[PDB]
């Protein structure tokens, strides 16, 4: 259209990180169809949201207030400090009051009501017809022991969020030939092409070409006639073409987004495997048209146009539903689930095991399944089970409707719940066969309904866009169809944020280069760090930006003097920022780490599960003092990390008292007391230590990341312990004698805190077991979309053994107590070993 419209699209391109208008790496118009197909659901959400409520984004939870927070409010009183420049009073509030109602007990109490309640030093607001007990910031203050300092000011202008105006024949495939520029290697070996029909990873039919010597060009021109008929092709079928010696792979949809059968000449560029993951399921081809392996294929063959169970049989089926998500279905089991479709339907938790039993390569069977889906009585009115819903969104299911019934359950999730699972759901898009889908349209809508959900969504999409060449095609389209609806308010914010993170990443890679691999850190690289920051703080670094992992915090100027580089193998950047928000309570500068080398996506996923792991314990009234710091991956092996103030590494405390590489059990307790100003805060630090050393000890054990080096765990000056750097004899978890010495026990004995330690650990361990399916599915998704080439059995299976699936709570209690004992015997053996 207009020239200004070109600049708007040019503005979006830089914000996404990928050119959406690009049509060089595509053989069809699935991107453009999806791009225009998302215009309706975007405007159907933009023109549907409340302009005022969206501007203020009041983050609220609807879950009941837990028992470990009612103890602080053992008086039915809340002390709010309403700031107003040089004026601040303390109005006593009841734990069941309304933002509008508490204003009335202020204006009349002091002595015009067009003002707003806003957090001091943050962009968080307290408004809406919701009890003050339901605000997450209020509950945050009650957890750590803080006072809710609010400020009286004018509500943000809702006009700033202005969105700018807008056959029965058997299927066959002709494998013509392959082409590759460079091949030279060691000894010669044979090579062939394997064609497969995929629908949820399971192969419906397999054909194979004749083995030939691996040369820079091999031609077959042979038809591979599959046994499956053209009419028996299910919606979202994949033509999996793979070159074995496996070296190259590429996928192509047998049925397009238009329901039409794909036909014509196709030359695809295949991805290379490093000498399973979602990257093997992608529909997009390799943009590196030069160095990648080519493959020419031809297609020319539109479509899609009572009896109650006996006692012993139903008891056999009930056992199949009771089994874990990672339990294989026998040909005997596969038939039982299907034959009794109607009785199997009456169990929400049986759907994943039901649809896996469905043979999708049959016209009639598929047709009967849709008839089964038409009568979703129990499923629709059932209580929302998240882990169950997630199961129907993984790789195992590719049917558009089977995945659609899951998204329906996600609709009932509120904003707070979306924030917990946002990373995984955005990651779950990889398992989708098509670009436009119910799940994709869902995340878009929720991101447009909430500024906070949208903020993380932006960085969650942008993470995969920058580095994952497999799915960046899809994610970029989803991001564009969000930026066109988030409003100019956030569009400005993202431009500020993108400029900052890109400028500093360039500095990160420059400084990391100007030094060797060996740790040293000289005044040279320190002065070079100082020099580059001086040029940025000028007319380069924008006045103030929003912290990507903490949207409420608005960081601005740099504390250049407090910046340095760590004396480690991979050189990062310790950075501190001045809070541009002047209504703040302290001079506390915001700490940010820019690190290259480690894959932050993996660290990002672990932290998210930990954030979910807290809510699991929260529902059962348990606090485990988990401290999942902010972390968002922005590019390849490079991203952003939060700094926890007053936190020191347990290993460094050993370096501060004993030798540099050469361990005293007493050191830890001495460090806590000297940093403690009073005796009480020390007792609070000792108690907090138990909780945090109980939270991570359980969490890190389940996820299989328990065996960590001494430097990989850090502790605050207030006793809060937490693991760091989730890059990727043995010990279940880290619990060395120096940790025990603080609790009172030394060298296998018993103390009042160690009994409490075991009490909390057990009560936390079985509490997770009551969510077995939710944790397992997130674990399986984590490895497939975050980690590299995982084991399709061994790696996923680990968590089943760790959660002791099968045995009762009493055997489980004993099992976990046994795992502690394994750490009681080794002591320092493992930590001393950590060198190889
Ligand atoms: O690299 C680390 C160790 C580390 N620290 C992390 N942060 C430290 C601050 O608290 C949150 C976790 C995360 C992480 O993954 N690894 N620390 C560091 C690096 C450069 C300069 C100064 C300190």
UniProtKB/Swiss-Prot annotation:
Q: In which pathway does it act?
A: Phospholipid metabolism; phosphatidylinositol phosphate biosynthesis
Q: Where is the PI3K-RBD domain?
A: 75-154
Does the record bear Nucleus in its keywords? no
Which intervals of the chain are annotated as region Catalytic loop?
704-712
Protein's cellular compartments: Cytoplasm; Cell membrane
What reaction gets catalysed by this protein?
Answer: a 1,2-diacyl-sn-glycero-3-phospho-(1D-myo-inositol) + ATP = a 1,2-diacyl-sn-glycero-3-phospho-(1D-myo-inositol-3-phosphate) + ADP + H(+); a 1,2-diacyl-sn-glycero-3-phospho-(1D-myo-inositol-4,5-bisphosphate) + ATP = a 1,2-diacyl-sn-glycero-3-phospho-(1D-myo-inositol-3,4,5-trisphosphate) + ADP + H(+); a 1,2-diacyl-sn-glycero-3-phospho-(1D-myo-inositol 4-phosphate) + ATP = a 1,2-diacyl-sn-glycero-3-phospho-(1D-myo-inositol-3,4-bisphosphate) + ADP + H(+); L-seryl-[protein] + ATP = O-phospho-L-seryl-[protein] + ADP + H(+)
Q: Where do the segments described as G-loop lie?
A: 565-571
Point out the signal peptide segment.
none
Point out residues bearing the modification Phosphothreonine.
772
Q: What does this protein do?
A: Phosphoinositide-3-kinase (PI3K) that phosphorylates PtdIns(4,5)P2 (Phosphatidylinositol 4,5-bisphosphate) to generate phosphatidylinositol 3,4,5-trisphosphate (PIP3). PIP3 plays a key role by recruiting PH domain-containing proteins to the membrane, including AKT1 and PDPK1, activating signaling cascades involved in cell growth, survival, proliferation, motility and morphology. Links G-protein coupled receptor activation to PIP3 production. Involved in immune, inflammatory and allergic responses. Modulates leukocyte chemotaxis to inflammatory sites and in response to chemoattractant agents.
UniProt family annotation: Belongs to the PI3/PI4-kinase family.
The entry's protein name is Phosphatidylinositol 4,5-bisphosphate 3-kinase catalytic subunit gamma isoform
Task: State the species of origin.
Answer: Homo sapiens (Human)
What's the encoding gene here? Answer: PIK3CG
């Amino acid at each position: 259209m207009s020239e200004e419209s070109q600049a708007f699209q040019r503005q979006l391109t830089a914000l996404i990180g990928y050119d959406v208008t690009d049509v060089s790496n595509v053989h069809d118009d699935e991107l453009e169809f999806t791009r225009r197909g998302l215009v309706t659901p975007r405007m159907a959400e933009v023109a549907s949201r409340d302009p005022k409520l969206y501007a203020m984004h009041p983050w609220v939870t609807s879950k009941p207030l837990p028992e470990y927070l009612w103890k602080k409010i053992a008086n039915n009183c809340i002390f709010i400090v309403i700031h107003r420049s040089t004026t601040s009073q303390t109005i006593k509030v009841s734990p069941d009051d309304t933002p509008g109602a508490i204003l009335q007990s202020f204006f009349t109490k002091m002595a015009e009501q067009d003002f707003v309640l806003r957090v001091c030093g943050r962009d968080e607001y307290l408004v809406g017809e919701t009890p003050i007990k339901n605000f997450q910031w209020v509950r945050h203050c009650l957890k750590n022991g803080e006072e809710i300092h609010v400020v009286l000011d004018t509500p943000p202008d809702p006009a700033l969020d202005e969105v700018r105006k807008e056959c029965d024949r058997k299927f066959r495939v002709k494998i013509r030939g392959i082409d590759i520029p460079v091949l030279p290697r060691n000894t010669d070996l044979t090579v062939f092409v394997e064609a497969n029909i995929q629908h949820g990873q399971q192969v419906l039919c397999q054909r194979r070409t004749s083995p030939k010597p691996f040369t820079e060009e091999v031609l077959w021109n042979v038809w591979l006639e599959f046994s499956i008929k053209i009419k028996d092709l299910p919606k979202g079928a994949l033509l999996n073409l793979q070159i074995y010696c496996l070296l190259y792979y590429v996928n192509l949809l047998l049925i397009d987004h238009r329901f039409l059968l794909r036909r014509g000449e196709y030359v695809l560029h295949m991805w290379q495997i490093s000498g399973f993951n979602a990257d093997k399921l992608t529909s997009a081809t390799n943009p590196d048209k030069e160095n990648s392996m080519s493959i020419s294929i031809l297609l020319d063959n539109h479509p899609i146009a009572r009896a109650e169970m006996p006692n012993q049989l139903r008891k056999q089926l009930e056992a199949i539903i009771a089994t874990d998500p990672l339990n294989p279905l026998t040909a005997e089991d596969k038939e039982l689930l299907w034959h009794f479709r109607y009785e199997s339907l009456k169990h929400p938790k049986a759907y994943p095991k039901l649809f896996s039993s469905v043979k999708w390569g049959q016209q009639e069977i598929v047709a009967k399944t849709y008839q089964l889906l038409a009568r979703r009585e129990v499923w629709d009115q059932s209580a929302l089970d998240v882990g169950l819903t997630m199961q129907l969104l993984d790789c195992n299911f590719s049917d558009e409707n089977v995945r659609a019934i899951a998204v329906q359950k996600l609709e009932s999730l509120e904003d707070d719940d979306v924030l917990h699972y946002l990373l995984q759901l955005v990651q779950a898009v990889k398992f989708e066969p098509y670009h436009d889908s119910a799940l994709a349209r869902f995340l878009l809508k929720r991101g447009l309904r909430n500024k906070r959900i949208g903020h993380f969504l932006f960085w969650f999409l942008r993470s995969e866009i920058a580095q994952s060449r497999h799915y960046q095609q899809r994610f970029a389209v989803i991001l564009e169809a969000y930026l066109r609806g988030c409003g100019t308010a956030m569009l400005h914010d993202f431009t500020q944020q993108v400029q900052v993170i890109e400028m500093l990443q360039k500095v990160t890679l420059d400084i990391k280069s100007l030094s060797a691999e060996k740790y040293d850190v000289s005044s040279q690289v320190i002065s070079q760090l100082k020099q580059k920051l001086e040029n940025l703080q000028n007319s380069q670094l924008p006045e103030s930006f929003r912290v990507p992992y903490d949207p409420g915090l608005k960081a601005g100027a740099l504390a250049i003097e407090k910046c340095k580089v760590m004396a480690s193998k991979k050189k990062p950047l310790w950075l501190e920022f001045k809070c541009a928000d002047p209504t703040a309570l302290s001079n506390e500068t915001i700490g940010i780490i820019f690190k290259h080398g480690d894959d932050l996506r993996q660290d990002m996923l672990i932290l998210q599960i930990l954030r979910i792991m807290e809510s699991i314990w929260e529902t059962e009234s348990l606090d485990l003092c988990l401290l999942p710091y902010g972390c968002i991956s922005t590019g390849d092996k490079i991203g952003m990390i939060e700094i926890v103030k007053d936190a020191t590494t347990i290993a460094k405390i050993q370096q501060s008292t004993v030798g540099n590489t050469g361990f005293k059990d007493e050191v830890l307790n001495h460090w806590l007391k000297e940093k403690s100003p009073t005796e009480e805060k020390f007792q609070a630090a000792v108690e907090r230590f138990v909780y945090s050393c109980a939270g991570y000890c359980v969490a890190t054990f389940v996820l299989g990341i328990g065996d960590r080096h001494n430097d990989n765990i850090m502790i605050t000056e207030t006793g809060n312990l937490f693991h760091i750097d989730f890059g990727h004899e043995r010990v279940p978890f880290v619990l060395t004698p120096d940790f025990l010495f603080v609790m009172g026990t030394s060298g296998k004995k018993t103390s009042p805190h160690f009994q409490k330690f075991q009490d909390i650990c057990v009560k936390a361990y079985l509490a997770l077991r009551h969510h077995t399916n939710l944790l397992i599915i997130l674990f399986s998704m984590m490895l497939m979309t975050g980690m590299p080439q995982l084991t399709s059995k061994e790696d996923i299976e680990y968590i089943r053994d760790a959660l002791t699936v099968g045995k009762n709570e009493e055997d489980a209690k004993k099992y976990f107590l046994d795992q502690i004992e394994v750490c009681r015997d080794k002591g320092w053996t493992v930590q001393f070993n950590w060198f190889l």
